[PDB]
Amino acid sequence: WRIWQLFDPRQALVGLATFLFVLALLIHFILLSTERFNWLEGAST
Amino acid sequence: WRIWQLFDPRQALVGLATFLFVLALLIHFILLSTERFNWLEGAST
Amino acid sequence: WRIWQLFDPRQALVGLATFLFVLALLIHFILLSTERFNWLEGAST
Amino acid sequence: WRIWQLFDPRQALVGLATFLFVLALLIHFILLSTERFNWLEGAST
Amino acid sequence: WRIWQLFDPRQALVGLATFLFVLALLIHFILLSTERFNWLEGAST
Amino acid sequence: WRIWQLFDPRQALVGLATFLFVLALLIHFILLSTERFNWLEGAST
Amino acid sequence: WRIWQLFDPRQALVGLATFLFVLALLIHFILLSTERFNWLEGAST
Amino acid sequence: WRIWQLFDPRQALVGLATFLFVLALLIHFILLSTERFNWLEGAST
Amino acid sequence: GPIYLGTTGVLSLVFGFFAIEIIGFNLLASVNWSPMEFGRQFFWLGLEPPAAEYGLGFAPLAEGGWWQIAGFFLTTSILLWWVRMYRRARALKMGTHTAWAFASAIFLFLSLGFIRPLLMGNFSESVPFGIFPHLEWTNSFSLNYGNFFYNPFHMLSIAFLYGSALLFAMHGATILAVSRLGGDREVEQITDRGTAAERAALFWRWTMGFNATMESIHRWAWWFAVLCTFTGAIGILLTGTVVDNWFEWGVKHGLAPAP
Amino acid sequence: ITEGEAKEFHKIFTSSILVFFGVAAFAHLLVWIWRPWVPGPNGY
Amino acid sequence: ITEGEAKEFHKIFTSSILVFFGVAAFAHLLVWIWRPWVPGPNGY
Amino acid sequence: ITEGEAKEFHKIFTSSILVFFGVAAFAHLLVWIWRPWVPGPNGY
Amino acid sequence: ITEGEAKEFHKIFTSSILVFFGVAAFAHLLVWIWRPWVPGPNGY
Amino acid sequence: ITEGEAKEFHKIFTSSILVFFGVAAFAHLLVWIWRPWVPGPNGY
Amino acid sequence: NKGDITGYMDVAQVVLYAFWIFFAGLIIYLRREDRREGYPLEDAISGKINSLQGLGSVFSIARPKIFKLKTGATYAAPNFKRDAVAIKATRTAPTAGAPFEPTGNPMTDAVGPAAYALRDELPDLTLGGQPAIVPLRVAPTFSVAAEDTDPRGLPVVDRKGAVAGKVTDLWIDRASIAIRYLEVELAATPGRKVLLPFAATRINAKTKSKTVTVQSILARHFANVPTIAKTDSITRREEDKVMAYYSSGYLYSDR
Amino acid sequence: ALLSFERKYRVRGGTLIGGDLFDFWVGPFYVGFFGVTTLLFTVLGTALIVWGAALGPSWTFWQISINPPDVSYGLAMAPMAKGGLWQIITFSAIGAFVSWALREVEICRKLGIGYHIPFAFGFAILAYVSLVVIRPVMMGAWGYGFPYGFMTHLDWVSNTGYQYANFHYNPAHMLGITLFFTTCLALALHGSLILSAANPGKGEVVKGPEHENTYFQDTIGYSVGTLGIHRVGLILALSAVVWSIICMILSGPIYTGSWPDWWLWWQKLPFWNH
Numbered sequence A, B, C, D, E, F, G, H: 001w002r003i004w005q006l007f008d009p010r011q012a013l014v015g016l017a018t019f020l021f022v023l024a025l026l027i028h029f030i031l032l033s034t035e036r037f038n039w040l041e042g043a044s045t
Numbered sequence I: 001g002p003i004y005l006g007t008t009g010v011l012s013l014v015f016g017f018f019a020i021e022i023i024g025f026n027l028l029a030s031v032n033w034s035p036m037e038f039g040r041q042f043f044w045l046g047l048e049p050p051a052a053e054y055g056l057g058f059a060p061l062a063e064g065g066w067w068q069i070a071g072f073f074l075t076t077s078i079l080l081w082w083v084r085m086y087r088r089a090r091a092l093k094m095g096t097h098t099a100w101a102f103a104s105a106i107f108l109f110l111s112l113g114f115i116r117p118l119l120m121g122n123f124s125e126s127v128p129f130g131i132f133p134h135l136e137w138t139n140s141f142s143l144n145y146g147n148f149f150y151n152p153f154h155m156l157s158i159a160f161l162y163g164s165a166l167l168f169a170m171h172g173a174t175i176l177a178v179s180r181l182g183g184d185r186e187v188e189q190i191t192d193r194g195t196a197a198e199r200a201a202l203f204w205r206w207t208m209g210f211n212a213t214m215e216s217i218h219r220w221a222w223w224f225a226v227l228c229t230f231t232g233a234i235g236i237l238l239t240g241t242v243v244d245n246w247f248e249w250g251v252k253h254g255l256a257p258a259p
Numbered sequence J, K, L, M, N: 001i002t003e004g005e006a007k008e009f010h011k012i013f014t015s016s017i018l019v020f021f022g023v024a025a026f027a028h029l030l031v032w033i034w035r036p037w038v039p040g041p042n043g044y
Numbered sequence O: 001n002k003g004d005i006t007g008y009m010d011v012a013q014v015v016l017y018a019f020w021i022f023f024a025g026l027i028i029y030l031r032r033e034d035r036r037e038g039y040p041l042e043d044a045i046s047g048k049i050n051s052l053q054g055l056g057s058v059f060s061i062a063r064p065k066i067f068k069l070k071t072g073a074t075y076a077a078p079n080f081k082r083d084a085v086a087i088k089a090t091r092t093a094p095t096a097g098a099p100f101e102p103t104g105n106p107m108t109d110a111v112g113p114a115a116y117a118l119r120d121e122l123p124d125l126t127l128g129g130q131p132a133i134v135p136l137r138v139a140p141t142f143s144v145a146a147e148d149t150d151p152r153g154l155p156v157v158d159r160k161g162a163v164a165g166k167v168t169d170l171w172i173d174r175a176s177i178a179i180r181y182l183e184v185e186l187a188a189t190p191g192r193k194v195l196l197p198f199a200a201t202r203i204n205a206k207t208k209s210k211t212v213t214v215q216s217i218l219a220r221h222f223a224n225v226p227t228i229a230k231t232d233s234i235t236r237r238e239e240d241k242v243m244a245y246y247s248s249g250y251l252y253s254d255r
Numbered sequence P: 001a002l003l004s005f006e007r008k009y010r011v012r013g014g015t016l017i018g019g020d021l022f023d024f025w026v027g028p029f030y031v032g033f034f035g036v037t038t039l040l041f042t043v044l045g046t047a048l049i050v051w052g053a054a055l056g057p058s059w060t061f062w063q064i065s066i067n068p069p070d071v072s073y074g075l076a077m078a079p080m081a082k083g084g085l086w087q088i089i090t091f092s093a094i095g096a097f098v099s100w101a102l103r104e105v106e107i108c109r110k111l112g113i114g115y116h117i118p119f120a121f122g123f124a125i126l127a128y129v130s131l132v133v134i135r136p137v138m139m140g141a142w143g144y145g146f147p148y149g150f151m152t153h154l155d156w157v158s159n160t161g162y163q164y165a166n167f168h169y170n171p172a173h174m175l176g177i178t179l180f181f182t183t184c185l186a187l188a189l190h191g192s193l194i195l196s197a198a199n200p201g202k203g204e205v206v207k208g209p210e211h212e213n214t215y216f217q218d219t220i221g222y223s224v225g226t227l228g229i230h231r232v233g234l235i236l237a238l239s240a241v242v243w244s245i246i247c248m249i250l251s252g253p254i255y256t257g258s259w260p261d262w263w264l265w266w267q268k269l270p271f272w273n274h
C-alpha cells in the first residue's frame, strides 16, 4: 500500500511492463550493434 | 488470478497475441538478416 | 471452448482467415525471393 | 453446414468469387512474368 | 434456377456484362502487347 | 423480348450509343496507329 | 418515329448537334495532322 | 516536510523520476559515445 | 491554455526538450558560439548523422554521437506524444483516430530516420537536423537513387498529398457553402441528417455522379491523409534496399523508354 | 414495363441491330478485300 | 423472386451462355488453327 | 438463415466446389504434362 | 453465444483445424522430401 | 482500491519483482561467465 | 538480381500490387460508408426501390450502425426512412430527369431551396443537458465581446433598402460559442417576432446604424418566416425550417 | 435513380444561361448548358489526346505524351503535327474546366448554397492556366508548358526545377511546401476529430462540440472551432496553390538565375557581413 495508495494498479503495471520491454529491446539492440557482444555474428574475442 | 479482475481477459489475449506475433516475426526477420542463421540460404559455417 | 464465449466466432474466423492468407502469401513470396526454393525459375542446387 | 447460418450465402459467394478471380489473375500474371511458364512468349526449355 | 432466388437477375446481368467486357479488353490488350499474337503488326513466326 | 422487360429501353439505348461510339473511336485510333492499317499515311505493304 | 416518343425532340436535336460538331472538328483536326490530307500545307502526293 | 505541503507528492515524484531517468540515459549514451569509457567496445587506456 | 500533459506529457516534453537542447547546442558550437554567425548561417547549419563506418553503434560525440543521442531522444519524445494523444482520446471517451493518423506520420519519420538506416546497416544516409541540410538530403537522396519521380510509391504519396489538398478545398468550401444551413455542426448533422448535409450530398451528386455523407467524407479525408505518409514510408523503405535505381526500375516496368 | 410496348421495342430493336450488323459486316468484308488482318506464317 | 420466373430466367440464361460458349469455342478453334499458343520443348 | 435452406445450400455448394476442384485438377495435370514446375537437383 | 453453441463451434473448429494442420504437415513433408531447408555444417 | 486489495497487490508485486530480478541476475551472471563487459587496462 | 522475385517480377512491383489490392478494398469500404444516407436509390417517377446496379449490390449497403446519444435515444444509419413520394410540385416533362415546377408558393410549400429535412423535434443539448440554443435573456452569463458591435437595437434592412424590423434579441449557442439567430421584431404587425439566421446576415459597416443587411429575402417575406413553438428554445426541425426558408430567397425572392 | 431526399430538391430554375432547354438530369448528373459545353470540350480533348497517342511511338499509358510546340515557334500557333495538337488540347481543357466551374455555379444556384466550391475550383483552374498559358506567355514561347503525359510532365517538372540549380531554395516554393504539408496535417486532424466524436468506441455515447474542443485544447493547447477549421482548411489549400503559382511565376519570367544563389542576401546583411 506504500506506493499503491496513490498510483493506479493497472496503470502502474502497464507502464512498468511497457518501460521494461522497451528498455530490454534497447539494450539488446545496443548489444547487437557491438562487435564483441553480437551473439548472432559471433566475432572473435 | 486477480490480474484478470484488473485486466479484461479478452483485451489481454488480443494484445498478447498481437505482441507475440510481432515479436516472433521480428526475430525471424533478424535471423534471416544474419548470415549464420539464414536457413533459406544455408551459408556454410 | 470458452474462448468462443470470449470472441465472436464469425469475426474470429474472418480475422483468422485473413491473417492466415496474408501469412501464406508472405511465406510464398519469401520462398520465391530465395534462390534455392524458387520453383518457378528452378535454379540448380 | 452451420457455416452458412454463420455467413450470409450471398455475401460469402460474392466474396469468394472476387477472391478467386483476384488470386487467379495474380497467379496468371506471375506465370507470365516467368520465362519457363510464359505460354505467350514460348521460350525454349 | 435457384441462384436467381439469391441474386437479382438484372444485377447479375449487369455485373456479368461489365466483368466480361473488362476481361476481354484486358486479354486483347495482352495479345496486342505480345509479338506472336499481335495480328495488327503481323510479326513473322 | 423479355430483355426490355428487365431493362429500361431509354437507358439501354443511351448506354449502347455511348459505349459503341467510344469503342468505334478507340478501334479506329488503334488502326490509325499501325503501319499496315493507317489509311491516312498509306504505307506500302 | 417512336424514337421521339422515347426522347425529347429539342434535347435530342441539341445533343446530336453537339456530337456532330465534335465529330467534324475531330476529323478535321486529324486531317490537318496528317500530311497527305493537310490542304493548308499542301504537301505533294 | 514543509516542501510537501506545497508540492503534491505524486507530481513531484513523477517529475523527479522522469528527469532522473532521462539524465541517466543521456549520461550513459554520452559515455558510450566516448572511446575511453565505452565498456561494450573497450579499448586501451 | 488548458493543456493536459500528465505523466506521458511530462516524459515526452522532457525527452523532446533534451533533444532540442542538444541540437541547438551543436548548431551553436558549429559556428564557434557566435550569435552573429548563428544568425547568418542558421539555415545552413546542421547536425549531420554519423558516417557509414560506425554502423549502428555509438559514434564519437563530435562525429555523429550527438546526432544519435538527439535522434533517439526525439524518437522517444514522438512515441510518447503518440501515447499521450492515444490516452487523451481514451480519457475523453472518444476514438483513437487522431492517434492512428499520427501513427502514419510517425511511421514515415521512423522510416526516414531509423528503420531504413537499420535495414541498410548504418546511419550515413539518415536525415540531418537542419533546414537546408535536410533539403539537401532530400535532393541528394533523389539524385543518388535514380529519380524519385519514378518511384511508384513516391507517385502515390504525391497523389495522396494532392488529394488531401483537393479534398480539404472541397470539404471546407462545401461546409462554408452550407454554413447558412447549419452545416458546420457536422456531428449533429451525422446524428440527425439535415438539409445542409442533404444539399451538400446532392450538389456533389449532381456535379460528379456520386456523393459522400457527413461522416464518410471525413473517412475519405482521414484515409487520404494517412495513405500519403504510409505510401511514402513504403517507398522510402524500398528505396535502395531492394531498388537501387528508380529510373531503371521504371524503364524495366515500362514507365520510360529505354535510353 | 408493359408487354406490348416491350415487344414493340424488341421488334424495332431487332431490325435496327440487324441493319447495324449488316452494315458492319459489309464494311468488314470491304476492309478484308482491301487488306486482310490475319498474317500468315511469314507475316505480312 | 419466385421459382417460376427464376426457372424461365435460368432457361434463357442457359441458352444464352451455351451460345456464348459455342461462339467462344469456335473463335478459339480458329485462333488455334491460325497460331497455337502452347509452345513445345524448343519453343515456337 | 434457416436449417433446411442452409443444408440445401451446403449440398449445392459441395457439388459446385467438387466440380471446380476437379476442373482445376485436370487443368493442373495438363500443365504438368506440358511443363512440370518442380525442378530437380540440376534444375530444368 | 450459448454454451451448446460454443461447444458445437469448438468441435467443428477443432475438426477443421486438425484437417488444416494435417494437410499442411503433408505439404511440408513433400517439400522436405524435395529439398530440405535445414543446412548442414557445410551448407547445402 | 481498498486496503485488502492494496495488500494483495503489494504481495503479488513483491513476488513477481523478486522473480524478475532473480532471473535477470542469473542471466547477467551467465553473460559475465561467457564474456565479461568490463575492459582491462589493455582492453579485451 | 537484388529484388527479383522471378525473371520479371520484383519486390517493389509486388508491394505496389498489394497496395493496389488494398486500395481497391478501401474504395469499396469508403463507398459502403458513403451509402449510409439516402440509399437504396428509388425510381424517379414511381418512387419504388429500383436502380441500375451490378453484382456488387450485395456488398454495396452495409448493416445499419447505431449511434448512441447522451439522451438515451439511438439513431440508425442507414435508417431507411424515405421522404414522401408526393410533393407540392409537378414535373415540367414526363421524363424521369425532368425538373419540378412548384404548384403554389415554393417558400411556404418547402420545395427546392426552401425544402428542409424532417429532423427530430428536439433542441440541441449541451454537455449538461440544457438546450444549446437559447436567447440571451435565458443565458445571463454569456455576453457579446466589447470589441464587437451588439446587433440588438440595430435595424434590419433588405437588399432593396426596405426596413424589415429591429433586432430585439440574440440567440446564442452554448455548446460551440457563437451567435446563431437574431430575433427581429417586424415593423408590420407590431409584436410579431421572427427568427433570423446569423450566417445569412452581414453588417453594413459604416452606415451610422450598421444596418444588419439580409440579402436572402426581401422585407415582405419576413411575415412568412416559420414560427417556433417555444420562446426560449428551438427544435432541430424548426431550426432547419428557418434556415431553409431563408436560403430559398436567392432563387424565389423575385418570384 | 434518386436518393431518398432528392425529389424535393430537383426543381426548375437556377440556370445561368440556356433557360429550360438544359435544365434536366441524366441519371445522377445535372446536365445544364455548361455541362453540355463540358461534354463537348471533354470529348474533343480526350479524342485529340488519344489521337496524339496514336501518332506517338508507344501505346503504353505511362509513355503516352503530347508535347508542346518547340521553343523556336514562339507564341505562334504551330502545325498540328508539331505542337498544334497540344495547343488545341490545352484550350479545350481550359474550356472544359471553365464550363465545369460554371456548371457547379448553376448547381449552387439551384440548391441555394454558397459559391465557395466553384470559387475554390477557380484556383485550380488558375494554377493550370498559369502553368500552360501565363508562364509560357510571359516566357515567350509555348514550349515552356508541360507536356500532357503521365511521365513526361514529371520529366518537365524535374527539368524545370533543375534549370534553377535547386528548386528547393525558391522562397515561394518553400511556402507552398509548408502550406501543402499543413493542409494534409490539418485534414488528418479534422477527419480524426470528427470520426472520433461520431465513433467514440463501442458502448459509448456520441460526443459533441464541447468534447471536440476539449480534446484538442488538452492535447495541443488550443482549438479553432466548428466552422473555423473548415475556413482554415480552405484558406490553407488555396494559399498553397497561390504560393505555388507565385513561385512558378517567379521561376523564369522574373528570376532566371540560381535559387540557391538567391539566398546570399541573407548572409550579406549589414549586421552579419564580416
Ligand code: 07D
Residues within 6 Å of the ligand: I020, I023, I074, I078, I105, I106, I108, I109, I112, I129, I137, I138, I139, I140, I141, I142, I143, I148, I149, I154, I157, I158, I161, I228, I229, I231, I232, I233, I235, I236, P157, P158, P181, P184
Ligand atoms: C529532389 C527532391 C525531390 C523531388 C524532385 C521530388 C518531387 C516531389 N515530391 Mg517527393 N521529391 C523529391 C525527393 C523526395 N520526396 C520526398 C517525399 C515526398 C513527400 C513528403 C510527404 C510528407 O507529408 O512529408 C512530411 C512528413 C514527414 C517528413 C514526417 C512527419 C514528421 C513527424 C510526425 C515528426 C514530428 C516533428 C516534431 C515533433 C518536431 C521535431 C523537431 C526538430 C527535428 C527540431 C511528398 C508527398 C512529396 C512530394 C513531392 C512533390 C509534390 C514533388 C514535386 C512537385 O516535384 N515527396 C518522400 C516520402 O516518402 O514522402 C512521404 C521522401 O521522403 C522524399 C524525398 C527524398
Ligand code: 07D
Residues within 6 Å of the ligand: A013, A014, A016, A017, A020, A021, A024, A025, A028, A031, A039, B003, B007, B012, B016, B027, N020, N023, N024, N025, N027, N028, N031
Ligand atoms: C548474451 C546476450 C543475450 C542473448 C543471446 C539474448 C537472447 C535473447 N533475449 Mg535477452 N539475451 C541476452 C542477454 C540478456 N537478455 C536478457 C533478458 C531477456 C528478457 C527480458 C524480457 C523483458 O524485458 O520482459 C519485460 C516484461 C515484463 C517484465 C512484464 C511483467 C509484467 C508486469 C510488470 C505487469 C503485467 C502487465 C502487463 C504485461 C500488461 C498487460 C496485461 C496482461 C498481459 C495480463 C527476455 C525474456 C529475453 C529474451 C531474449 C530474446 C528474445 C533473445 C534473442 C532472440 O536474441 N532477454 C533477461 C531478463 O530480463 O529476464 C527476466 C536478462 O536479464 C537478460 C540478459 C543478460
Ligand code: 07D
Residues within 6 Å of the ligand: I138, I139, P097, P124, P125, P127, P128, P131, P156, P157, P158, P160, P161, P162, P166, P167, P168, P173, P176, P177, P180, P240, P241, P244, P245, P248
Ligand atoms: C528539381 C525538382 C523539384 C524539387 C527539388 C521540388 C521539391 C518539392 N516540390 Mg516543387 N520541386 C521540384 C520541381 C518543381 N516543383 C514544382 C511545383 C511544386 C508545387 C505545386 C503544387 C500545386 O499547387 O499543384 C496544383 C495543381 C494543379 C496544377 C491543379 C490543376 C488541375 C486542374 C485544373 C484539374 C484537372 C482535371 C482534370 C484533367 C479532369 C480529371 C478527370 C477525371 C478524373 C475523370 C509544389 C507545392 C511543389 C511540391 C514539392 C515538394 C513538396 C517538394 C519536395 C518533397 O521536396 N512543387 C510547381 C508548380 O506546379 O507550381 C504551380 C512546379 O511547376 C514545379 C517544379 C518545376
Ligand SMILES: CC[C@H]1c2cc3[nH]c4c(c3C)C(=O)[C@H](C(=O)OC)c4c3nc(cc4[nH]c(cc(n2)[C@@H]1C)c(C(C)=O)c4C)[C@@H](C)[C@@H]3CCC(=O)OC/C=C(\C)CCC[C@H](C)CCC[C@H](C)CCCC(C)C
Residues within 6 Å of the ligand: H019, I012, I013, I014, I015, I016, I017, I020, I077, I078, I081, I082, I085, I098, I099, I101, I102, I104, I105, I225, I226, I228, I229, P181, P182, P184, P185, P188, P189, P192, P219, P220
Ligand atoms: C497524415 C500525415 C500528416 C501528419 C499528421 C499528423 N501529425 C501530427 C498529428 C497528425 C494526425 C497529431 O495528432 C500530432 C499533433 O499533435 O498535431 C497537432 C502531429 C504532429 N506532427 C507535427 C509536425 C509535423 N507534421 C508534419 C506532417 C504530417 N503529419 C503529414 C502531412 C510535418 C512535416 C514535416 O510536414 C511536421 C513537422 C507536430 C506539430 C505534432 C507532434 C508533436 C510532437 O511529437 O512533439 C514532441 C514533443 C516535443 C518536441 C517536446 C518539446 C518541448 C519544448 C522544448 C518545450 C519545453 C518543455 C519543458 C520546458 C521541458 C522540461 C525541462 C526540464 C527537464 C529542465
Ligand SMILES: CC[C@H]1c2cc3[nH]c4c(c3C)C(=O)[C@H](C(=O)OC)c4c3nc(cc4[nH]c(cc(n2)[C@@H]1C)c(C(C)=O)c4C)[C@@H](C)[C@@H]3CCC(=O)OC/C=C(\C)CCC[C@H](C)CCC[C@H](C)CCCC(C)C
Residues within 6 Å of the ligand: I162, I163, I165, I166, I169, I170, I173, I207, I208, P038, P041, P042, P043, P044, P045, P046, P090, P092, P093, P096, P097, P100, P104, P117, P118, P120, P121, P123, P124, P147, P148, P149, P150, P153, P237, P238, P241
Ligand atoms: C485549388 C485547391 C485544390 C483543388 C480544388 C478543387 N478541385 C476540384 C474542385 C475543387 C474545389 C471541384 O469542385 C472539382 C470537382 O468536382 O472535383 C471532384 C475539382 C476537380 N479537380 C480535379 C483534379 C485535380 N485537382 C487538383 C488540385 C487541386 N484542386 C488543388 C490542390 C489536382 C492536382 C494535380 O493536384 C488534380 C489532378 C478533378 C477531380 C476535378 C475537375 C473536373 C473537371 O475539370 O471536369 C471537366 C473535365 C473533364 C471531365 C475532363 C477534361 C479532359 C481534358 C479535355 C483534357 C485535359 C488534359 C490535361 C491538360 C493533361 C492530362 C495529363 C496529365 C498527366 C498532365
Ligand SMILES: COC1=C(OC)C(=O)C(C/C=C(\C)CC/C=C(\C)CC/C=C(\C)CC/C=C(\C)CC/C=C(\C)CC/C=C(\C)CC/C=C(\C)CC/C=C(\C)CC/C=C(\C)CCC=C(C)C)=C(C)C1=O
Residues within 6 Å of the ligand: F014, F018, G014, G015, G016, G018, G019, G022, I166, I167, I170, I171, I172, I174, I175, I197, I200, I201, I204, I207, I208, I209, I210, I211, I212, I213, I214, I217, I220, P026, P027, P029, P030, P031, P035, P036, P038, P039, P040, P042, P043
Ligand atoms: C459535406 O460533405 C461533403 C459531402 O457530402 C456530404 C461529399 O459528398 C463531398 C464530396 C466528396 C466525395 C464524394 C469523396 C470522393 C471525392 C474525391 C476522392 C475527389 C476526387 C474525385 C474523383 C476522382 C471523381 C472525378 C469524376 C468526375 C470529374 C465526374 C466525371 C463526369 C463527366 C465526365 C460527365 C459530366 C456530366 C455531364 C456533363 C452530363 C452527363 C453525362 C453523361 C451521363 C454521359 C453522356 C450522356 C449522353 C451521351 C446523353 C446526353 C448527351 C448530350 C447532352 C450531348 C453531348 C454531346 C456529346 C456526344 C459530347 C464533400 C467534399 C463534402 O464535403
Ligand SMILES: COC1=C(OC)C(=O)C(C/C=C(\C)CC/C=C(\C)CC/C=C(\C)CC/C=C(\C)CC/C=C(\C)CC/C=C(\C)CC/C=C(\C)CC/C=C(\C)CC/C=C(\C)CCC=C(C)C)=C(C)C1=O
Residues within 6 Å of the ligand: P182, P185, P186, P189, P190, P191, P193, P194, P212, P213, P216, P220, P221, P222, P223, P224, P225, P226, P229, P232
Ligand atoms: C471540428 O473542429 C476541430 C477543432 O475545433 C473544434 C479543432 O480545434 C481542430 C484542431 C486544429 C487546430 C487547433 C489548428 C489546426 C490548424 C493548423 C494545423 C494550421 C496552423 C498550424 C499551427 C499553428 C501548428 C499547431 C500545432 C501544434 C500547436 C502542435 C503542438 C505540439 C507541442 C505542444 C509539442 C511541442 C511543440 C513543438 C516542438 C513545436 C510545435 C509547433 C508550433 C507551436 C508552431 C511552430 C512554432 C515554432 C517552431 C517557432 C515559432 C514560435 C512561436 C509561434 C512563438 C513566438 C511567436 C511568433 C509569432 C514567432 C480540428 C482539427 C477540428 O477538426
Ligand SMILES: COC(C)(C)C/C=C/C(C)=C/C=C/C(C)=C/C=C/C(C)=C/C=C/C=C(C)/C=C/C=C(C)/C=C/C=C(C)/C=C/CC(C)(C)OC
Residues within 6 Å of the ligand: D021, D024, D025, D028, D029, E009, E013, E016, E026, E027, E030, F002, F003, F005, F006, K005, K008, K009, K012, K013, K016, K017, K020
Ligand atoms: C427475369 O427474367 C425475365 C423473366 C424477364 C426473362 C429474361 C431473360 C433474359 C433477358 C436473360 C438474359 C440472359 C443472358 C444475356 C445471359 C448471358 C450469359 C452469359 C454470357 C454468361 C457468361 C458467363 C461467363 C463466365 C462466368 C466466365 C468467367 C470467366 C472467368 C472468371 C475467367 C477468368 C480468367 C482469368 C482469371 C485469367 C485470365 C488470363 C489473363 C491473361 C487475363 O491473366 C493475366
Ligand SMILES: COC(C)(C)C/C=C/C(C)=C/C=C/C(C)=C/C=C/C(C)=C/C=C/C=C(C)/C=C/C=C(C)/C=C/C=C(C)/C=C/CC(C)(C)OC
Residues within 6 Å of the ligand: H002, H003, H005, H006
Ligand atoms: C510556504 O512555505 C513553507 C512554510 C511550507 C516552507 C517551504 C519551504 C521550501 C519548499 C523550501 C525550498 C527551498 C529550496 C529547494 C531552495 C533552493 C534554492 C536554490 C537552489 C537557489 C539557487 C539560486 C541560483 C541562482 C539565483 C543563480 C543565478 C545565476 C545566474 C543568473 C547566472 C547566469 C550566468 C550566465 C548568463 C553566464 C553564462 C556563461 C555561458 C558560458 C553559459 O554563457 C554562454
Ligand SMILES: COC(C)(C)C/C=C/C(C)=C/C=C/C(C)=C/C=C/C(C)=C/C=C/C=C(C)/C=C/C=C(C)/C=C/C=C(C)/C=C/CC(C)(C)OC
Residues within 6 Å of the ligand: A009, A013, A016, A020, A026, A027, A030, B002, B003, B005, B006, H021, H024, H025, H028, H029, N001, N004, N005, N006, N008, N009, N010, N012, N013, N014, N016, N017, N020
Ligand atoms: C489491486 O490488486 C489486486 C487485489 C487485484 C491484486 C492484483 C495483483 C497483481 C495483478 C499483481 C501483479 C504483479 C506484477 C506482475 C508485478 C511485476 C513487477 C515487475 C516485473 C517489476 C519490475 C520492476 C523493474 C524496475 C523498477 C526497474 C527499473 C530500472 C531502471 C529505471 C533502469 C534504468 C536504466 C538506465 C537509465 C540505464 C541504461 C543504460 C543504457 C543507456 C546503456 O541502456 C540502454
Ligand SMILES: COC(C)(C)C/C=C/C(C)=C/C=C/C(C)=C/C=C/C(C)=C/C=C\C=C(C)\C=C\C=C(C)\C=C\C=C(C)\C=C\CC(C)(C)OC
Residues within 6 Å of the ligand: A030, A033, I020, I021, I023, I024, I025, I027, I056, I057, I058, I059, I068, I069, I071, I072, I075, I109, I110, I112, I113, I114, I126, I127, I128, I129, I130, I131, I134
Ligand atoms: C533554449 O535553447 C534553444 C531552444 C534556443 C535551443 C535551440 C534549438 C534549435 C534552434 C533547434 C532546432 C534546430 C533546427 C534548425 C532543427 C531542424 C530540424 C529538421 C528540419 C529536421 C528534419 C529531419 C530530421 C529527421 C527526419 C531525422 C530523424 C532521425 C531519427 C528518427 C533518428 C533516430 C535515431 C535513433 C533511434 C538512434 C539509435 C541508435 C542508439 C542511440 C539507440 O544507439 C546507437
Ligand SMILES: [Fe+3]
Residues within 6 Å of the ligand: I189, I190, I191, I193, I197, I213, I214, I215, O037
Ligand atoms: Fe449525414
